[PDB]
Design a protein around this ligand. Structure first.
Ligand SMILES: Cc1cc(Br)c2c(c1)C(=O)C(=O)N2
Length: 168
């Protein structure tokens, strides 16, 4: 459990690896995997789509039941659901979608959710379709998260860019 290998230590508590977060979850068996969620927990693409596909749609079936009963999340908010075959727990965190005019300031609130878990496997929040600058997201992660966070970045050129930012 929580067998993270090959990570680069950026700060006392933030580590980063050029890896596919699904293959990391399968290798590492983390207590917590973080999903880059939306407020309706519709896992139709990006990390959310990849994680749900890896669970054989278990995640989407559970999420649909959660939303029908409980209503949507708030931007900056989170819920803990089953980690299925990937982790003990999935922390579904909603970062702002700046592509849709949501406030980038809520990225701090999104990362604050990580502090309720001792160790996490996570993507950068508000990246990809959510439209935030990934170098900014990593800075907010480092500034906000006090617990141990292992970041998985799939794209090599983005990974090198991110590492060249805290180290150059
Ligand atoms: C200055 C600098 C830049 C990059 Br990208 C790096 C490093 C150091 C590392 O040590 C590493 O692994 N990637």
């Amino acid at each position: 459990v929580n067998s993270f290998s090959g990570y680069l230590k950026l700060t006392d508590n933030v580590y980063i690896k050029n890896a596919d977060i699904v293959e990391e979850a399968k290798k590492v068996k983390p207590t917590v995997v973080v999903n880059a969620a939306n407020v309706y927990l519709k896992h139709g693409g990006g990390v959310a789509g990849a994680l749900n596909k890896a669970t054989n749609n278990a995640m989407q079936v559970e999420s649909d039941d959660y939303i029908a009963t409980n209503g949507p999340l708030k931007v900056g908010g989170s819920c803990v659901l089953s980690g299925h075959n990937l982790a003990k727990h999935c922390l579904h965190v909603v970062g702002p979608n700046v592509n849709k005019g949501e406030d980038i300031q809520l990225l701090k609130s999104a990362y604050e959710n990580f502090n309720q878990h001792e160790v996490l496997l996570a993507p950068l929040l508000s990246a990809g379709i959510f439209g935030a600058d990934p170098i900014h997201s990593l800075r907010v992660c480092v500034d906000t998260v006090r617990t141990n966070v292992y970041l998985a970045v799939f794209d090599k050129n983005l990974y090198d860019k991110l590492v060249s930012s805290f180290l150059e």
